[model samples]
Target: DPMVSKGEELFTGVVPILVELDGDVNGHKFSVSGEGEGDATYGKLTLKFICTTGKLPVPWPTLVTTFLMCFARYPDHMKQHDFFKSAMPEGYVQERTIFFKDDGNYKTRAEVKFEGDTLVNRIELKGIDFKEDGNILGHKLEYNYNSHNVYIMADKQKNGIKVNFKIRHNIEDGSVQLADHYQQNTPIGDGPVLLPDNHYLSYQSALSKDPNEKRDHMVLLEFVTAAGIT
Candidate 1:
């Protein structure tokens, strides 16, 4: 629960992502496009997913959980942005502005721009602007190359309520990893440590393995073309 500068904190929403690969069950829309070199070897991998949003009710301070003019929500929209970024070029942000159109509620136009030294990506889920009654609006992510932190504010904007969620975990010695994380910070000694584990991965992969672990690595093989794996 958070309070914004102008009273009445708006409701929040989560955009569902549907990933489809060669023989995957999801839809084959929203192309994964990029530019330049990515992680030394992994360039852009054509991928697509649902740009639709499903809203869940909030419980605020008496009026907190209640909804009024549902605008300005919290929760960083970084996780999803990272998903697209992985499929983007290494210097995609520094080069040209990338735009993704997902027809849903803002018509959902997503753009990636280099804001100073940071990479700023925003998904305006039907940018229903200032009053005048429109669809849901304002969704964005700001990733700092300097601090290595990605900030998210889903559906609406809420201050300082940040979560460090990574979509592309890392580039190993020769591979790229995509992470849909479960983040938590535990204390060891004096400071708290954030847990970086994609616990759902193995579960998602192991769901179907014809030869036992065949598709068990599906999470990695996902969104891969016939070429397969980054």
Candidate 2:
């Protein structure tokens, strides 16, 4: 909670600074700044501003120019810089462990690993999905990533379903990339066959019948998500 609170304060506090620069260049004071915290050493802060129409006043050529100026001046704020770098460390990593239960039975356990330098890494979802009838429908469901975004390209069978999703930081602070699925109609086959009584879906595949079943399926689900270092 402390970390979260600190993050909120840092991002909110900077918005007004941006708006201030926006207004100053346009000859209008459209910016405002606010602050919040738990104690003297912790909390959240915010800054906000609004512009009217598509035109900027004299001394401002365009909104993009103002933004560029703001961007150039952003590093001038030492407090904001320190907060982002120290409060939200670069190259930070975390994991979320999820447990699944169905029909009074332990279905599967999944670990979502998140890593990043400034932004979170593409998360890898390792888990299982089961059908309501207690049958395992699929196992080893995987997702691919492009930079900090997770992209699932539609396969030959289902070109209609393509998934391109990314996790952005709230208030432009930071974010953790989540899993995404784009390929469709590729034989919902995997894990155990589904039955009507299963309560949850199985994401893992069933034991192969052939001696080389594992080897054959190995190529089916292989992907890695990597995040940009910046």
Candidate 3:
């Protein structure tokens, strides 16, 4: 009955969350945007989602009924799942720079970066000098440090060098936490607030536990981790 116990704990843990979602589900699309800081730069991240129940041709009543049911049962789950899947890290952004040739031609570049526990280190990019036109755009860079990844874009313009940093979410945390249980004011989450003492353990435990189970399941574990439940 170990599994049952765990399941019971899970159910008990999840019931309140489900109940909290009452009157929250609807057939609609949602979008979120925010910004954070890196070593010395700032970045932004955005996410979007839609909720509906229809193949192609359906009435509002059906959609509304379906959405209501789904929301009532899995309101917290849906929100948590969507948020983490589309969350940007503490400091996530889309960076771009352009270089103009002496002949007036221009080259453009872009990259994405993620901030880590410490400073924003690890970086990644679509590739340097990535361009559609016949010109030297810019260089893309990426690196990994302390389990976090970062992406950067650098361009050598006619006048000077322009560097841009875009912070993607922390690969693991972003996918599991932000995608599912984020808020406008908190951005992160309330139950699973990050603490200095538990930071590393919380992250490692998350990976060992469900690993990428789903937004709902993630919330359960995240709350436990934040609360020192284990």
How well is each residue in 9-85 modelled by candidate 3, as lDDT tens digits?
A: 22222121111101111222222111222111111111111212222121111111011000111122122221111
Best-performing candidate as measured by TM-score: 2
lDDT of each residue in 41-102, candidate 1, tens digit only: 12112112221221211100000000000111112321222222222211111111111122
Ranking by TM-score: 2, 1, 3
lDDT, each prediction: 0.19, 0.21, 0.18
lDDT of 2 by residue, 1-230 (tens): 34334432333332322112213321232322111111112221121222333322221111111120111111221222221122232211222222223311111111111123112222222333324332112222222112233332323332122223322111112322222222121212122211111011111111112344222111111112121211
Better of 1 and 3 by TM-score: 1
Off by over 4 Å in 1: 1-40, 43-106, 127-230
| Model 1, position 187: C-alpha lDDT score | 17
lDDT ranking, high to low? 2, 1, 3
RMSD of each: 20.8, 26.0, 19.8
Per-candidate TM-score against the hidden true structure: 0.17, 0.19, 0.15
What lDDT score goes with residue 162 in model 1?
21
The stretch of ten residues in a row with the least summed lDDT in candidate 1 is: 59-68
Candidate 3 stretches with Cα past 4 Å from truth are: 1-89, 103-116, 125-230
Displacement of residue 3 (Cα, Å) in model 3 is 42
What's the lDDT for residue 223 in model 2? 17
The Cα RMSD of model 1 versus the native structure comes to 20.8
